[PDB]
Design a binder for these strands. Structure first.
Ligand SMILES: [Mg+2]
Ligand SMILES: [Mg+2]
Ligand SMILES: [Mg+2]
Ligand SMILES: [Mg+2]
Ligand SMILES: [Mg+2]
Ligand SMILES: [Mg+2]
Ligand SMILES: [Mg+2]
Ligand SMILES: [Mg+2]
Ligand SMILES: [Mg+2]
Ligand SMILES: [Mg+2]
Ligand SMILES: [Mg+2]
Ligand SMILES: [Mg+2]
Ligand SMILES: [Mg+2]
Ligand SMILES: [Mg+2]
Ligand SMILES: [Mg+2]
Ligand SMILES: [Mg+2]
Ligand SMILES: [Mg+2]
Ligand SMILES: [Mg+2]
Ligand SMILES: [Mg+2]
Ligand SMILES: [Mg+2]
Ligand SMILES: [Mg+2]
Ligand SMILES: [Mg+2]
Ligand SMILES: [Mg+2]
Ligand SMILES: [Mg+2]
Ligand SMILES: [Mg+2]
Ligand SMILES: [Mg+2]
Ligand SMILES: [Mg+2]
Ligand SMILES: [Mg+2]
Ligand SMILES: [Mg+2]
Ligand SMILES: [Mg+2]
Ligand SMILES: [Mg+2]
Ligand SMILES: [Mg+2]
Ligand SMILES: [Mg+2]
Ligand SMILES: [Mg+2]
Ligand SMILES: [Mg+2]
Ligand SMILES: [Mg+2]
Ligand SMILES: [Mg+2]
Ligand SMILES: [Mg+2]
Ligand SMILES: [Mg+2]
Ligand SMILES: [Mg+2]
Ligand SMILES: [Mg+2]
Ligand SMILES: [Mg+2]
Ligand SMILES: [Mg+2]
Ligand SMILES: [Mg+2]
Ligand SMILES: [Mg+2]
Ligand SMILES: [Mg+2]
Ligand SMILES: [Mg+2]
Ligand SMILES: [Mg+2]
Ligand SMILES: [Mg+2]
Ligand SMILES: [Mg+2]
Ligand SMILES: [Mg+2]
Ligand SMILES: [Mg+2]
Ligand SMILES: [Mg+2]
Ligand SMILES: [Mg+2]
Ligand SMILES: [Mg+2]
Ligand SMILES: [Mg+2]
Ligand SMILES: [Mg+2]
Ligand SMILES: [Mg+2]
Ligand SMILES: [Mg+2]
Ligand SMILES: [Mg+2]
Ligand SMILES: [Mg+2]
Lengths: 70, 188, 595, 263, 118
RNA sequence: UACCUGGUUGAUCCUGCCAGUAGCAUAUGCUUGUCUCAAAGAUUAAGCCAUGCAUGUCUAAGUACGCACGGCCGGUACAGUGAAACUGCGAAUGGCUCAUUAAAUCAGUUAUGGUUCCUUUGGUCGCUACUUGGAUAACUGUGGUAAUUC
RNA sequence: GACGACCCAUUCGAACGUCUGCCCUAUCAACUUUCGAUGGUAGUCGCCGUGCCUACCAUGGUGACCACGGGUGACGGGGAAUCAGGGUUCGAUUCCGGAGAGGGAGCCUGAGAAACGGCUACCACAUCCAAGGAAGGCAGCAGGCGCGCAAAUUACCCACUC
RNA sequence: CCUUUAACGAGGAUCCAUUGGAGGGCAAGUCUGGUCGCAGCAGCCGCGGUAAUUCCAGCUCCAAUAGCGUAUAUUAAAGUU
């Protein structure tokens, strides 16, 4: 659920086993998918993807360069 | 706030449109090997400075002869080219400019002349020497490998007057070891 | 990083007209956990102090302006100047010292005041909070480039303005120093300013009253006289109203204010009642958690700062949650039984000396069942009285030998417990209870936790005094002998200690005598009181235990102070010794309102 | 806001013929109110440090001018941003040199030293003619001067040679076909030639022709002609190259032949 | 709050004062303010009154009238001097001017006087 | 450098679009040795604001009895340095932002023969008198209010 | 020589006016008017021209060549990005013009202001209090809260341009 | 700060170059180990159901390089205004 609008949207998590970093009720920064309005690939009706969970990247949370702040 | 500055600046290259094209990659790699440059960008600079000359040449050649503008600017452009050794005074006319190849701007680089005028063992050794402040143009050290040598500056390139290679104190290696004979081989 | 919370205080929150879009979409309510507590009802929509994430979605969609964000305090690890040692209390940024005016500081006991003062005086270099490899005046003077500290620290490194400071404790320095009467003062710095501070502080008697003669109040007066005459450029004053006369607080205030003018930096820190408004010009409030971490705020004006410290507890920027409105115990509730078994342990009007003090007595109808409070100026012998009752001079020419067992609280804080206090908690034992008298007293500022296991030598005097109180009411006694119990304590823990000892001993219909120099604890402990009249160095008479009003009337009219009770927070304040109010109150004698 | 007159002038917006740089700082001297227009003037500060190099910074100009050394038309001016302009005759006594402000043929002022037996008279161009109270005829020149009782044949667009200690006009050239002229506006700035024509479109900007000493002709507006000679004989001395405005194909040849790359 | 002439009440009121008025000093050429002043009537709701003596009786007030008037300061406009010493049109206006005597614990004593103006 | 390439079919030829491709400018991720330039709270909220600072000014030439300092003894217009205070001038330029505003603003073009203009520059200055009047500030002294550049 | 001063000119302007030039919208086709809308006569007022405003009189003016109404994440331009040739999109932003100091309104002083680093009042906020009263305007420079995907130090100095 | 200069300062196991790919479009492996229509990849076509040139990793190779990837607005490609 977004901060500014308050409206609800579904988002993808972009690599093998990342869904364990995402605790419940923390923030996230969602981005676009890649075709400017449209669901990409085989997923039905998902148009956004995560980049940061709690001010730390997914690419760094997953490559080991950083660990969760808690 | 108002401020006392120049914001004027500009780009000096243009990437190619086809990013992975073999006829391109192999030619540019050849040109990097034969003159010992660093990136592809060191080639795209030369491509730009030639493709921009070839626009002024063309737009002049599409004026009518006897024009004031065409006369003045053509006599100015040929002079500027001849003065760096890219054109022959036996040509001196616009319809020859369109016949120049990229490998004539590359040829006039200081790195190229320092090798081809004999002061270094290879086109790679030359780039090292220039960057180490071993060479001098006319009563002036230079440190930029890409410096373009004007036609009558040609025979001034020689080794620096404060440098080991010709009238200078030996460097910090030839001196640390000669000291190993009096501080490491006499009482050490 | 900062812990954002939503709050609801509003002009008529309307759970009867809005249909409660307030609760219909907090993200936490959707996932089971209840953040908000409201349905169609009559009054305020409650909210959890902790279950909102700080989402702010709670705010964007109330139709009326009900909900808003506040920033609860947290340990940020941003702008850490120092750590008391590795792993210890964390200190954030310092106040920028404005010259030409007195810079004051306020906060609870043990939040970073004396460390900030010791840093600003160059006596502690900053370590940037590192446990290891503390820097050395090149990385310092780069950590605060582009800031006033860049130039300020160089001006103190080349000593172009070399600092001077006053100590925290009164009991230390007359042992640590040596000097005979008067000659130390004469040889220290000057004669001229020496002469003006000596007269306006009323210590002209200490040409011949020696450094061994003088009391802890008279020692603070010496400490302040000596640092005022000491020739330096920047000044500091740690606790400069610890054990002073209610008029001499303002006299200390005036004699420090008299050096404002000549481009001198000055910082003062106090646990003030009504004294600093005349002392300081700008205020900087402190917030944090005690001996764990402490944050300093930007400057404020005197009234504005004193107000954002207790007229609520919110900065213009952020929040903290401490120091609310209770500086007078408006909870007017007191009830215990009448009992006709009453013992009237009276005493003769014995006359006694030592070398110089004629301090007369008149008889008093002292009784077992309630506390009697004591008034009087500093240096009039409110101490020697119950010191003599405790098995010293003149029990022979009369003097009622203690009928019940004696618990003695001495005012010179010096318990001889090397090691830790835990073994001094063996000449008593705790196990006799585990009860509100012990818990609600010893705990409040954190827990009982810091004052069980610690060397008493590195101690905040506050909790050592809380332990001296605990070993006083932890000894076999019934007559409890007290002397300035409120000293070295903040406001709210002063009142906690006062209230809880009143209530605890009044469970038993039990004896104590209390020595106060303050107001709040004195006013909520009393139904009778003794007064000391006359000026020191020659004579004094302990008048008989009278009522409260007429007694402290004899007190204040002798001191010529009147007070004012602001109703919004029942706050006390001094009327400025000449007023359109200082004429009615001094004609009718009323200096105590709203009984 | 603008609610009153401005008093600063930005460096970029300044006139071009001042030939100011770009990277010193944001402002330019902003000539003070005077007899010469703001675009046509040349402040005294720009003449002493950008041209004659006598001073180096603004304060040196201020302390050169305060010592009462500089004279603009005989009088002693102490204001460093005073608006000198075309036909003004700066005199520096302490050195013994004099100058005349005349446009160089690229359309800008240049230093032009004159003999001290010449810097006693300056030319003016008549702008208005009117009969004052009691029937006295007056005159207004291009630099705001007012001459009372002038000869009753001097009319508009004419030129008059005055003296700097009296005013009191001495000679006058009459605007007609055949006299010399210097042009003081627009594209043709600082060119010289015989007037040779004047067309007249009533109510709008009458046009004038000219003709150089090499056949070149160039029209202009009449309000930009400034007669400087009876015919083929300029009264006042002239800068080198005499307003001939050679083309760039000729300027290159002279630069090459003279090889003026040193001294 | 002071009192000013001509506001006939015992109350207090707010007036728009300007230059030339009383109870006001303007901070900027061409300014006006709105401030509170008490009416001219006298009542027990004051705190002070300024009274000036106009006719003195026979018994001297102990600490108000027995003292002596100071030297004040002398005149500086030429005709003011002439009017004070009843001088003729051609008496020297010089010589007569009040030569202010000056003593301090520092230097030699001195006499000053004003520069005479007209 | 005036350019295309993958994808509907068992295969083919088309229409046709989705995807790739190169630049640009805002955000963000990973990474970072040297050296010359240098943008930077516009986008949302023209939302709210603790503290400090951003506008003052004296010459030979308006008014000097502050003894404040002062010298060769004198003010006999009156020396000389000069705080303060009256007087004059400036504060309407500069800086910041882009809410408003669609024949409005703005641009080029023209007109004031339909007006005003501190200042600068040049004109103009002849239909009790050897010099008039009273009254204020700084300064001295007494004050009021919790509080103010009262 | 300094200063002041009447009027004339000049200078720096300012003000009003002429011709041509604008993004999207017809699910905006008729609009405008004694609450002046177009014009005439005489005045009021104003620095001057003028329905600018008053009194009497006439019934006019604008529109398919898009009037009038609506929208603009619209301040205009010099310009910026890309660009065979034609074009498309951007221009809050250092130069020029305009407009505004929380929103609306009224005025003093002055050559010049409908001025907010000036004053007066209402609206919304907010500070001090002895509950009588007083005081305020960072879309100047730093700094702080808030807002958000989104933006630097509460440093130094008049030496340079002015 | 840059520039000008004395004195120290290089053997490569550091005085250590990264970011994204390797079926096609589109430069580069029909290597080896693991997983088994799961986990995942993939802008598009498409990969994975026990023998994966496409997933996870080692090795090797490719492109630009003190820089490279992603989201978004926009221009050329678009003779698809
Ligand atoms: Mg009062
Ligand atoms: Mg402006
Ligand atoms: Mg305005
Ligand atoms: Mg000027
Ligand atoms: Mg003297
Ligand atoms: Mg005079
Ligand atoms: Mg089909
Ligand atoms: Mg198929
Ligand atoms: Mg595409
Ligand atoms: Mg790229
Ligand atoms: Mg720089
Ligand atoms: Mg930019
Ligand atoms: Mg904004
Ligand atoms: Mg402020
Ligand atoms: Mg003087
Ligand atoms: Mg004088
Ligand atoms: Mg003044
Ligand atoms: Mg003015
Ligand atoms: Mg800004
Ligand atoms: Mg507007
Ligand atoms: Mg419209
Ligand atoms: Mg509109
Ligand atoms: Mg128009
Ligand atoms: Mg225009
Ligand atoms: Mg126009
Ligand atoms: Mg002036
Ligand atoms: Mg004049
Ligand atoms: Mg009419
Ligand atoms: Mg009319
Ligand atoms: Mg009609
Ligand atoms: Mg019609
Ligand atoms: Mg319209
Ligand atoms: Mg626009
Ligand atoms: Mg807008
Ligand atoms: Mg183009
Ligand atoms: Mg713009
Ligand atoms: Mg905007
Ligand atoms: Mg900006
Ligand atoms: Mg602008
Ligand atoms: Mg204009
Ligand atoms: Mg605002
Ligand atoms: Mg004025
Ligand atoms: Mg206004
Ligand atoms: Mg302003
Ligand atoms: Mg104001
Ligand atoms: Mg106000
Ligand atoms: Mg402001
Ligand atoms: Mg700001
Ligand atoms: Mg944030
Ligand atoms: Mg940014
Ligand atoms: Mg931010
Ligand atoms: Mg300066
Ligand atoms: Mg790799
Ligand atoms: Mg991959
Ligand atoms: Mg692989
Ligand atoms: Mg591929
Ligand atoms: Mg391939
Ligand atoms: Mg298997
Ligand atoms: Mg396998
Ligand atoms: Mg395999
Ligand atoms: Mg396009």
């Amino acid at each position: 659920q977004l901060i500014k609008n308050g409206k609800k949207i579904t988002a993808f998590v972009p690599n093998d086993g990342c869904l364990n970093f995402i605790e419940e009720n923390d923030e996230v920064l969602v981005a676009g998918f890649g075709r400017k309005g449209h669901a990409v690939g085989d997923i039905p009706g998902v148009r956004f993807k995560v980049v940061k969970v709690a001010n730390v990247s997914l690419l760094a949370l997953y490559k080991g360069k950083k660990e969760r702040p808690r | 706030m108002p401020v006392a500055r120049s914001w004027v600046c500009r780009k000096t290259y243009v990437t190619p449109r086809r990013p992975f094209e073999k006829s391109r990659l192999d030619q540019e790699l050849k040109l990097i090997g034969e003159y010992g440059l660093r990136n592809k960008r060191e080639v795209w600079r030369v491509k730009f400075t030639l493709a921009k000359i070839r626009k002024a040449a063309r737009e002049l050649l599409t004026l009518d002869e006897k024009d004031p503008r065409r006369l003045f600017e053509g006599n100015a452009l040929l002079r500027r080219l001849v003065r760096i050794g890219v054109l022959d005074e036996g040509k001196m006319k616009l319809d020859y400019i369109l016949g120049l190849k990229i490998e004539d701007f590359l040829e006039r680089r200081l790195q190229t002349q320092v090798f081809k005028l004999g002061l270094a063992k290879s086109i790679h050794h030359a780039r090292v020497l220039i960057r180490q402040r071993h060479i001098r143009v006319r009563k002036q050290v230079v440190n930029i490998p890409s410096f373009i040598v004007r036609l009558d500056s040609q025979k001034h390139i020689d080794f620096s007057l404060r440098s080991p290679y010709g009238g200078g104190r030996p460097g910090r290696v030839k001196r640390k070891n000669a000291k190993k004979g009096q501080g490491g081989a006499g009482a050490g | 990083k900062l812990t954002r919370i939503a709050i609801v205080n509003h002009d008529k929150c309307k759970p009867k007209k809005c249909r409660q879009e307030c609760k219909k979409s907090c993200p936490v309510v959707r996932m089971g956990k209840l953040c908000i507590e409201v349905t169609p009802q009559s009054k305020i929509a409650w909210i959890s102090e902790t279950l909102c994430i700080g989402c702010g979605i709670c705010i964007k969609k109330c139709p009326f302006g009900a909900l808003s964000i506040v920033n609860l305090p947290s340990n940020l690890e941003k702008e850490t100047t120092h750590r008391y040692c590795a792993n210890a209390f964390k200190l954030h940024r310092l106040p920028i010292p404005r010259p030409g005016e007195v810079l004051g500081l306020v906060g609870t006991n043990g939040i970073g005041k004396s460390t900030a003062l010791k840093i600003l005086a160059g006596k502690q270099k900053p370590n940037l909070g590192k446990y290891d490899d503390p820097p050395d005046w090149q990385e310092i003077l780069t950590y605060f480039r582009g800031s006033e500290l860049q130039n300020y620290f160089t001006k103190i490194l080349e000593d172009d303005l070399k600092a001077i400071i006053k100590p925290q404790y009164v009991d230390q320095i007359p042992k640590a120093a040596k000097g005979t009467v008067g000659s130390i003062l004469d040889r220290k710095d000057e004669t001229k300013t020496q002469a003006i501070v000596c007269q306006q502080l009323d210590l002209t008697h200490l040409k011949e009253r020696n450094v061994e003669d003088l009391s802890g109040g008279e020692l603070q007066r010496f400490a302040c006289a000596v640092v005022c005459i000491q020739k330096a450029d920047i000044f500091m004053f740690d606790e400069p109203s610890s054990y002073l006369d209610v008029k001499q607080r303002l006299k200390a205030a005036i004699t420090i204010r008299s050096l404002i003018n000549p481009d001198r930096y000055i910082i003062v820190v106090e646990h003030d009642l009504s004294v600093l408004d005349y002392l300081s010009d700008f205020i900087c409030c402190l917030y944090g958690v005690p001996s764990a971490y402490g944050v300093v705020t930007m400057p404020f004006s005197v009234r504005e700062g004193i107000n954002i410290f207790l007229d609520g507890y919110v900065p213009t920027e952020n929040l903290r949650f401490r120091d609310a409105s209770l500086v007078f115990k408006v909870a007017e509730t007191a009830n215990e039984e009448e009992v006709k078994k009453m013992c009237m342990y009276k005493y003769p009007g014995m006359k006694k000396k030592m070398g110089e003090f004629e301090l007369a007595i008149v008889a008093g109808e002292f009784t077992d069942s309630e506390i009697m409070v004591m008034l009087g100026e500093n240096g009039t012998g409110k101490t020697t009285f119950i010191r003599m009752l405790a098995g010293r001079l003149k029990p022979d020419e009369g003097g009622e030998v203690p009928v019940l067992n004696v618990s003695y609280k001495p005012q010179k804080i010096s318990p001889k417990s090397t090691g830790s206090v835990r073994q001094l908690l063996h000449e008593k034992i705790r196990d006799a209870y585990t009860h509100p008298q012990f818990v609600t007293d010893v705990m409040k500022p954190l827990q009982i936790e810091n004052i069980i296991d610690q060397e008493v030598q590195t101690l905040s005097g506050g909790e050592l005094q809380r332990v001296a109180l605990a070993l006083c009411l932890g000894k076999p006694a019934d007559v409890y002998l007290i002397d300035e119990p409120s000293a070295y304590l903040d406001s709210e823990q002063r009142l906690m200690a006062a209230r809880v000892v009143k209530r605890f001993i009044l469970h038993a219909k039990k004896t104590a005598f209390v020595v106060e120099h303050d107001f709040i604890m004195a006013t909520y402990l009393a139904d009778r009181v003794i007064v000391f009249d006359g000026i020191p160095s020659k004579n004094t008479v302990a008048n008989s235990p009278q009522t409260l009003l007429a007694g402290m009337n004899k007190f204040l009219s002798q001191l010529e102070i009147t007070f004012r009770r602001d109703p919004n927070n029942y706050r006390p304040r001094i009327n400025k010794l000449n007023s359109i109010k200082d004429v009615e109150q001094k004609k009718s004698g009323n200096y105590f309102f709203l009984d | 806001m603008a609610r009153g007159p401005k008093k600063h002038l930005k460096r970029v917006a300044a006139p071009k013929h001042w030939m100011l740089d770009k990277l010193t700082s944001v402002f330019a001297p902003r000539p003070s109110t005077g007899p010469h227009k703001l675009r046509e003037c040349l402040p005294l500060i720009i003449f002493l440090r950008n041209k004659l190099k006598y001073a180096l910074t603004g304060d040196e100009v201020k302390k050169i001018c305060m010592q009462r050394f500089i004279k603009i038309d005989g009088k002693v001016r102490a204001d460093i941003t005073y608006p000198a302009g075309f036909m003004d005759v700066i005199s520096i006594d302490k050195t013994g040199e004099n100058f005349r402000l005349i446009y160089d043929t690229k359309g800008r002022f240049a230093v032009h030293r004159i003999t001290p037996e010449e810097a006693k008279y300056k030319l003016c161009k008549v702008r208005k003619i009117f009969v004052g109270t009691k029937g006295i005829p007056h005159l207004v020149t291009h630099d705001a001067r007012t001459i009372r009782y002038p000869d009753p044949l001097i009319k508009m667009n004419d030129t008059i040679q005055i003296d700097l200690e009296t005013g009191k006009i001495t000679d006058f050239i009459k605007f007609d076909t055949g006299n010399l002229c210097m042009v003081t506006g627009g594209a043709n700035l600082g060119r010289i030639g015989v007037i040779t024509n004047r067309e007249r479109h009533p109510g709008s900007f009458d046009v004038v022709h000219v003709k150089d000493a090499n056949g070149n002709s160039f029209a202009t507006r009449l309000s930009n002609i400034f007669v400087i000679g009876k015919g083929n004989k300029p009264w006042i001395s002239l800068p080198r190259g005499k307003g001939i405005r050679l083309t760039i194909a000729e300027e290159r040849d002279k630069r090459l032949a003279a090889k003026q790359s040193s001294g | 709050f002071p009192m000013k002439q001509g506001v006939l009440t015992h109350g207090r009121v707010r007036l728009l004062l300007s230059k030339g008025h009383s109870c006001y000093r303007p901070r900027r050429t061409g300014e006006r303010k709105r401030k509170s002043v008490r009416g001219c009537i006298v009542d027990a709701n004051l705190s002070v009154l300024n009274l000036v003596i106009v006719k003195k009786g026979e018994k001297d007030i102990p600490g108000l009238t027995d003292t002596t008037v100071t030297r004040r300061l002398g005149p500086k406009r030429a005709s003011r001097i002439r009017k004070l010493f009843n001088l003729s049109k051609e008496d020297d206006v010089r010589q007569y001017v009040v030569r202010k005597p000056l003593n301090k614990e520092g230097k030699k004593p001195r006499t000053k006087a004003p520069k005479i103006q007209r």
